[PDB]
Design a protein around this motif. Structure first.
Motif, short mmCIF file in Angstrom:
data_model
loop_
_atom_site.label_atom_id
_atom_site.label_comp_id
_atom_site.label_asym_id
_atom_site.label_seq_id
_atom_site.Cartn_x
_atom_site.Cartn_y
_atom_site.Cartn_z
N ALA A 11 -11.16 43.14 -21.60
CA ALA A 11 -10.42 42.36 -22.63
C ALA A 11 -11.07 41.00 -22.88
N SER A 12 -11.58 40.37 -21.85
CA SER A 12 -12.21 39.04 -22.05
C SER A 12 -13.46 39.17 -22.92
N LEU A 13 -14.00 40.35 -23.04
CA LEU A 13 -15.20 40.54 -23.89
C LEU A 13 -14.80 40.54 -25.37
N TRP A 14 -13.73 41.21 -25.70
CA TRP A 14 -13.25 41.23 -27.11
C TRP A 14 -12.98 39.79 -27.54
N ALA A 15 -12.51 38.97 -26.64
CA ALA A 15 -12.24 37.55 -26.98
C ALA A 15 -13.56 36.81 -27.13
N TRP A 16 -14.57 37.28 -26.45
CA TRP A 16 -15.90 36.60 -26.49
C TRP A 16 -16.49 36.60 -27.91
#
Length: 27
Positions: A11-16
């Motif tokens: 999920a932190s990647l989609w925010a990236w």
């Protein structure tokens, strides 16, 4: 335990992608 297979770790990647906070450096 939890590796990179959990949606949370991914999920932190989609925010990236939306990390458009570095564009202000270019006025």
């Amino acid at each position: 335990e939890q590796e990179l297979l959990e949606l949370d770790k991914w999920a932190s990647l989609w925010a990236w992608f939306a990390i458009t906070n570095w564009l202000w450096y270019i006025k």
